[PDB]
Write a protein that binds this ligand. Structure first.
Ligand SMILES: CN1C(=O)[C@]2(CC(C)(C)Oc3ccc(-c4cccc(C#N)c4)cc32)N=C1N
Ligand code: NI
Length: 402
C-alpha cells in the first residue's frame, strides 16, 4: 500500500482543474492533461491555439497511426473537435508502462482551453458508454488495464488551497495525487467506506440523505439524485439539483445569518472578504451527504466543511483580506460531487469491484474545531429506492449494442 512515485503527481490552478503530466508519441512529447472522471475521451490539443504553448505534433511521432475518422464534441459551454488516431502513451509519474491508446487530436475548439490553466488536453477516466463518437472508442484506462497488468483501479487525492496565499497576481497553485492501480495508505486516515457504482457510464452513485449542520433536509431522496449523482474530478463545485440547491442555500443562509452577503455571493458571482485570518468559519455549517452502502439498508456519510465549499481567491485590490467564492451551485443535470467534495477525501475509483471509496484525506483543509469526516454505518430499516430512472428517448432506445 505504498506508491511513492505517484504521490504529488497532480498540479493545477484553483478552480481550473487538476492535471497530470503525460507523454504521447515516439519519442515522448510531454503534455499536461486534465484528470476528468466526468468524461471518457483522451483528447489533446494538436494544432496552434492562443492559450496553448505547445501541442501534440502527430508528424513528429513515428508510432502515430491515423484512424481516418473525425470526432465532434459539443457541450453546454462550447465544443472540441478533431481527428481520431492511436499512439503510444505513458504517465511519467505513474506506472512504469507504455500503452497504445486512442487519442483525439483536437484541431478546432471553442471555449475548451482556458488561458493560464496550463493544461493542453483531457484524460476522460469514465466509462465507454459516454465516449465519443460512440462506445466503441476504447477509453484510455480500459486500454491501460487490457494491455498491462495494472489493476483495474485508480485513486485521487485532490488537495485544496488555503490562506495565507503566496501570490496576488495569479490564482493559487493546487496539488494532488493520482495513484494508478492502487491505494496509498499515507494519503488517508481512518476508515475507507465504499458506495456502489450504480451504473458504469459516469461514476454514478446514490445519495440517500442530506444534512446541513446536523439538520435533515427531509426531501424525497430521489430529489438528491435527480436525474443522477456523479463523482466528477472535472467539475470544481458541489453542484446540486435546483430543489436541493434552494433548500441547501436556505439552510446555509440561516446558519450564517449574522453576516448579510449580497445575492451575488450565493450565486457564485461575487467574493466576500474578512480581514486576514479572521474568517468566522464557525458561522458556516457542515454539509453531510449520506451515500448508499455496500450492504442493503446501510449508508455512510461524508461530511465537508466551509473550508471546502468556500474557495479562497486572493484579490489584487483586496490583498490585505481573505476573500472567498461560494462553490455550491445549481444543476439541471443532477448532483455533481466535484472538487468541493473530493478535496475533503481520498477517493478510490474501484472499477474492478464496481464501487467508490471515501476516506478522510490526509491533506484536507480544516481547523481545530471541525474536520471533514467519513462515518458509518447508518442503518435504515426498509431503506427506500433513491435512484432516478432517466426517461428513455426513442433515439437512445433505437441503438443496438452488439
Ligand atoms: C463538467 N465537465 C465538463 O464540462 C468537461 C467536458 C469536456 C468535453 C471533457 O470538456 C471540458 C473542458 C474543461 C473542463 C473544465 C474547465 C475548468 C475547470 C474544470 C474543473 N474542475 C474543468 C471540463 C470539461 N468535463 C467535465 N467533467
Ligand atoms: Ni443490430
Amino acid at each position: 500500500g505504498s506508491f511513492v512515485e505517484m504521490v504529488d503527481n497532480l498540479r493545477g490552478k484553483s478552480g481550473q482543474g487538476y492535471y497530470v503530466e503525460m507523454t504521447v508519441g515516439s519519442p515522448p512529447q510531454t503534455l499536461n492533461i486534465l484528470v476528468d472522471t466526468g468524461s471518457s475521451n483522451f483528447a489533446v490539443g494538436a494544432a496552434p491555439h492562443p492559450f496553448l504553448h505547445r501541442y501534440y505534433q502527430r508528424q513528429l511521432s513515428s508510432t502515430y497511426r491515423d484512424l481516418r475518422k473525425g470526432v465532434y464534441v459539443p457541450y453546454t459551454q462550447g465544443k472540441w473537435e478533431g481527428e481520431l488516431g492511436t499512439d503510444l502513451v505513458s504517465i511519467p509519474h505513474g506506472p512504469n508502462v507504455t500503452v497504445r491508446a486512442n487519442i483525439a487530436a483536437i484541431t478546432e475548439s471553442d471555449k475548451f482551453f482556458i488561458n493560464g490553466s496550463n493544461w493542453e488536453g483531457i484524460l476522460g477516466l469514465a466509462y465507454a458508454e459516454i465516449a465519443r463518437p460512440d462506445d466503441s472508442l476504447e477509453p484510455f484506462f480500459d486500454s491501460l488495464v487490457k494491455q498491462t497488468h495494472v489493476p483495474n483501479l485508480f485513486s485521487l487525492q485532490l488537495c485544496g488551497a488555503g490562506f495565507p496565499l503566496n501570490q496576488s497576481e495569479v490564482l493559487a497553485s493546487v496539488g494532488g495525487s493520482m495513484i494508478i492501480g492502487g491505494i496509498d495508505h499515507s494519503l488517508y486516515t481512518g476508515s475507507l467506506w465504499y458506495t456502489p457504482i450504480r451504473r458504469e457510464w459516469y461514476y454514478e452513485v446514490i445519495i440517500v440523505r442530506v444534512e446541513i449542520n446536523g439538520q435533515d433536509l427531509k426531501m424525497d431522496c430521489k430529489e438528491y439524485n435527480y436525474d443522477k449523482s456523479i463523482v466528477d474530478s472535472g467539475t470544481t463545485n458541489l453542484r446540486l439539483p435546483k430543489k436541493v440547491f434552494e433548500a441547501a442555500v436556505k439552510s446555509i443562509k440561516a446558519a450564517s445569518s449574522t453576516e448579510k452577503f449580497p445575492d451575488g455571493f450565493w450565486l457564485g458571482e461575487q467574493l466576500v472578504c474578512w480581514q486576514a485570518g479572521t474568517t468566522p468559519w464557525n458561522i458556516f455549517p457542515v454539509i453531510s451527504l449520506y451515500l448508499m452502502g455496500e450492504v442493503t439498508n446501510q449508508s455512510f456519510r461524508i461530511t465537508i466543511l466551509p473550508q471546502q465549499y468556500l474557495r479562497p481567491v486572493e484579490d489584487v485590490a483586496t490583498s490585505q483580506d481573505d476573500c472567498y467564492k461560494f462553490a455550491i451551485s445549481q444543476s439541471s443535470t443532477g448532483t455533481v460531487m466535484g472538487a468541493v467534495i473530493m478535496e475533503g477525501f481520498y477517493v478510490v475509483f474501484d472499477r474492478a469491484r464496481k464501487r467508490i471509496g471515501f476516506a478522510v484525506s490526509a491533506c484536507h483543509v480544516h481547523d481545530e474545531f471541525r474536520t471533514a469526516a467519513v462515518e458509518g454505518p447508518f442503518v435504515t430499516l426498509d431503506m427506500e429506492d433513491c435512484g432516478y430512472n432517466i426517461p428513455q428517448t426513442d433515439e437512445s432506445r433505437s441503438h443496438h449494442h452488439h
